[PDB]
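User: My notes are a mess, but here's the protein and asparagine's SMILES. Can you give me a structure?
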Amino acid sequence: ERHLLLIYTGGALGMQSKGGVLVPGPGLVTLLRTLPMFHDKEFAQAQGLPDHALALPPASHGPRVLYTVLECQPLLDSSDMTIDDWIRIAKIIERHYEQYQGFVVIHGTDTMASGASMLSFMLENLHKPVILTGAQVPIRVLWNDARENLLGALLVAGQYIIPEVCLFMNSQLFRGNRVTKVDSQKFEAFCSPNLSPLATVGADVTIAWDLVRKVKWKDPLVVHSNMEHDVALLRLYPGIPASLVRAFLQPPLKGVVLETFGSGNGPSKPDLLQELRAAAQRGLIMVNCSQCLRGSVTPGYATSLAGANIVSGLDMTSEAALAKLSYVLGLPELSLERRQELLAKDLRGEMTLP
Amino acid sequence: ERHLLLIYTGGALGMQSKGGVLVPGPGLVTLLRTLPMFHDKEFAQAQGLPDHALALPPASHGPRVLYTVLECQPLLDSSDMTIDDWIRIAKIIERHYEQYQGFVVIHGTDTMASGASMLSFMLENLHKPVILTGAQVPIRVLWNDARENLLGALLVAGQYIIPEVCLFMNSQLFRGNRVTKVDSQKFEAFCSPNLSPLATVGADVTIAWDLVRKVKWKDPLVVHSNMEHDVALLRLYPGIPASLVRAFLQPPLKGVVLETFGSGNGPSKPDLLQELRAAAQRGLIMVNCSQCLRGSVTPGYATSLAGANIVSGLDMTSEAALAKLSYVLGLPELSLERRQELLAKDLRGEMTLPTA
Amino acid sequence: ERHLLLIYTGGALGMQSKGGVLVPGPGLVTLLRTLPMFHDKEFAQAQGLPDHALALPPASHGPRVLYTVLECQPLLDSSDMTIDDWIRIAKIIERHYEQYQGFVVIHGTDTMASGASMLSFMLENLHKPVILTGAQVPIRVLWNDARENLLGALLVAGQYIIPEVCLFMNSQLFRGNRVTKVDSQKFEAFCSPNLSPLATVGADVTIAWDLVRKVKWKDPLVVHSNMEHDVALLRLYPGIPASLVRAFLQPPLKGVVLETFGSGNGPSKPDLLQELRAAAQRGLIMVNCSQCLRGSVTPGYATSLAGANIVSGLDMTSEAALAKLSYVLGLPELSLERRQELLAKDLRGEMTLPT
Amino acid sequence: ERHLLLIYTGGALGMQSKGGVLVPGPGLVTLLRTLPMFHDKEFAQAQGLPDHALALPPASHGPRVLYTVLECQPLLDSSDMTIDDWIRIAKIIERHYEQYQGFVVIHGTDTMASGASMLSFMLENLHKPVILTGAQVPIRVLWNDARENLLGALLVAGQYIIPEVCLFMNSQLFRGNRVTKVDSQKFEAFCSPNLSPLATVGADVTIAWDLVRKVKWKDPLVVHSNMEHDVALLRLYPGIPASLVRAFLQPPLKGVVLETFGSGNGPSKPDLLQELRAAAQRGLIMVNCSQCLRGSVTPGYATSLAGANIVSGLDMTSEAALAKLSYVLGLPELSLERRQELLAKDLRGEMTLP
Ligand SMILES: NC(=O)C[C@H](N)C(=O)O
Ligand SMILES: NC(=O)C[C@H](N)C(=O)O
Ligand SMILES: NC(=O)C[C@H](N)C(=O)O
Ligand SMILES: NC(=O)C[C@H](N)C(=O)O
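Assistant: No problem, the inputs look usable. Here's the predicted complex:
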């Protein structure tokens, strides 16, 4: 047997209709008990399990999967989630780390990529799978993506040692800090533009073991609650004025992800560059990420944004860059130089170095 | 014969290396004269054409294509381009509208989607093709995408009546106000996520005539130089503070595209909503576009951002929404209500209104 | 309420492991009764339905869907299916046509595209949906695609009037005579390379009503049991000898789909062309389909295969071409010329004519 | 400088219109001389090169590329090409092997995948790139894919040591024995369904060095002219009769690729299985390939085709399987068992073992 903790934070997967809109819905364990694909009643009685503990039916062989449902309160639409919600989830995982062999987190899709990226950084030396999942359509609606997304997440966590924060949706397992949301309606909502999926499910399960990170059994789990909250993301647009950039970069901001054009470029107008220089003088750290879905930030143009206190984000998603910025700025007693060096490293599999 | 004006504004397609970086490069016509795929010298002499006028070799059939090169000064990396540059381009087109059957604009990739979207709005009642193109690699580097992009743009503009601002790249013709840049390195740099390409080139040329907009021969070209400059784009991120939104939405801003999560949703924390309400009270107009590449802003969640002075952008790209905002806010003597109604219409083929 | 007949012919969707291999598995209705997504017990009792009749939970809106399971015997791995099996299925549909509003057919994936194409031709003037579906993984294996494929097929048939033989898999509804199997392991096993899907399922259901064929309420269903069995498919390969083609095209063969290279081309070596000419003289009809997954057979090269008794298959799949060949050669009392004219028409939505 | 041999065998890339159809067109070198992208006249005079030798303009960096054009006569539409044409090409390569650093072969698209696969087997221990290319549209038509396909092939061969037979089209370099033709009209005519491209061209050139085969500098080039001609491909279709299979598998056939359904399955009707058994008794060797574009032949069904003298083709393209069959059956003095063992190995990167 392998035992999982299923953390239900909210999201459409569990929502219910109220006043003509979808809102978070409690009572997950109650529903899942009634579904044979999610709970094997015979086995529960035959083994006299507790009532909190659900049991998946068996595959041919491999261990049997048991799981406990922890329903957070209040449950959230993921558009309301922030760094503090992700820290709380990491702390749940830390508190129960020794009792379970893996974790599944049900989450709204709206900020799932940010949550996966944040958790990836918060869970240092992670040894066990932490699989986020969600749905475009609630599990209570007959035709939905929720059933198979949740089951897949549980079976991945229950059966494979993938020591990473991942996202499981639509038969694919992505590295959490590589994903971004690309479709607001289709079941294929997420893409990992600069990395293959870690796994695919079909007639068989194919895992990219060449990509999956190695378990560091020697090192203990270190959960970083020290994540810098004063970080932001700023998307450049043509003609963005220096005065607006000045206002945006005022204290107490400590870091910003600049989402630039193409291969990492912005306007070369001197008043704008002067505001970036001024911010650097104040100690602000800036990461240059491309607005483009695919590819990498590279130098080469006179408009390339590089310079004092600007670190290239290379091929990172903006979600990963913001999480990494929060993580690195939250580390105690480092110099600015050192913080910039850490930003330029691949710390969790989020960035490919050239 | 069909005659085209080729407007060279800058971009990597024409850049040269200086001090280890790419910068705009002058002298386009001089290079193109020397290239048989771009200039048929025999025909030029045989017909004694001017020296400014280049001539493409014959294509399979159809009219022969002649073109004149107008090289802007100064030439720009497109990351430095703004509404005033796009207005200037629209004015060049207006000035020479009667003399040519179509236009090709060489432009940097970095802001090409914005430029295409802006021009789409500025050129009201457009009757002739305006094809933007560019390249990931300069035409002076041997291994490049520039040659075939420029040629294709000229052949599309020269041979088909597609009365739209389009982007041509990597054998595809997109509707200009539907494109966005998706890849910073590959030759397939652009995507039209919520609309098919208007055309594809292979062994044959396939055109989606069911999509292409109809020529309104009755109506004259009206070029809008009255585009509102004080518009912005603001991308929401988890936990974005109300104080930062407040600072961003201060006067003199007149309109903003809010790029929200998923199907059009944002934090429901009251301090943030209050800043949006306050901005609306000051007369700011807001458009709600999704951060997601594909799909549409739709109501349905309690976190759906809707309310006073917020118009849904449905399936619009953010580049289109920003252009449409600039256009609509620049129109004289309209009420805030009327401006909002216009933002909710499909004015140039940039937005699909939902199905019943 | 709308009532469906669910015809279970076999396929991996229902298979069970025996002696270390998958083989067809009986007892479908028994399993489906125990699954709340497939059977609403409350509603069954509340309405006192029969035991053969299952009832789906309510969908968002629209009519409630009831269905009856017909389990064929013997059940087949679809690799063993032939024209006669497909004729039998068409006859089941014919026998029960008036009693149900639609049909779902559970079928193996291995020959599903051929089955869908054949049924498309056999069911002339079809007025109601006939939705084929299947699975890469059996429904009794916990982690599978079978649950959602079967449910979707039933909901599509139960809720929409799409008077076509279709294939439903992995959230997509394809025109049956436009599909081909492209992946032997992934859940996205099928593609419709030269036509959009007729429908897609996500948060919403999107249907291409401008593609869907119109119901011809005036005309009765005519089921063609007269399908020519002596048709074949021959894939050209570089250097294929004239002698082998000769042997392949011997009587009693009546028709062949030639799968040619690229835009419809073959070797121009005279000995091979002469065997094709000889076959034509004997009365064989040939259809030229491209080996390429996407695109169309078009003239333009000196190696283009065209000539006596060779009809261009344009953008047809090979499964559609073979079915259409069987159909057209089975029609009574037509000349060879007339049969060629019919092959050159779009008879069921399987072929796009140039324009 | 690096020197290439450009072998022009025919194909649409060079065709001309005659009597309303495209036919092979001579005079390639004459055309290429007049194109600045293909020939740097200044450099030619400055260096006083021969008139047969063309010179590419300088690329960004790396060695300068010179090439000689060998125009075969007669030129062929690739639909007319056979094992003997491919052997002749291999022999051209062998004859000139020491004089050049790489080879490009202009070829028709219709049978390019078969040609690439055949050459891959014929050129044992290949140390240098052999890049096939072609076009959907002739180079003499103004709007074409030919210019950039040919240039790219020359630059890839001229600048990288990829010791494989490859196909270059539409900015991608595929492993030759992994490709198949998927589109009869679009410029993206080819796909490598079970392997990534070896390289992609965009703003930069990205090479999958993890996939590219290693140069075996110890071993000499061995060109196999001993390729078995009596091999065939047979595509199964539903209800295919035993009598037709019997006729197809008659002597003198020595090997056949059976293209089966799905994961490698066929009818289990006894009369058909008996004909396969009979062919095996006669010494015929059979390879089981899937009709499906993507995936692999795997056991698992009762209808799985396996047995005496049947080797699984796993994930091979049919073009590769046929070439490998021709190669292995052409090897002198091997037992049937040894031949089957060789068919079950990955000999050139064409097959992924489980
Ligand atoms: N599909 C979803 O989960 C969307 C929802 N608004 C959320 O992010 O919580
Ligand atoms: N490839 C390009 O055109 C990028 C360049 N920085 C520009 O937009 O001008
Ligand atoms: N997935 C499947 O259904 C394959 C099976 N051999 C069949 O076609 O019956
Ligand atoms: N595009 C091409 O090259 C097709 C031509 N029939 C050939 O294979 O030679």
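The two ends of chain B are 47 Å apart (CA to CA).
User: Great, I'll file this with my notes.
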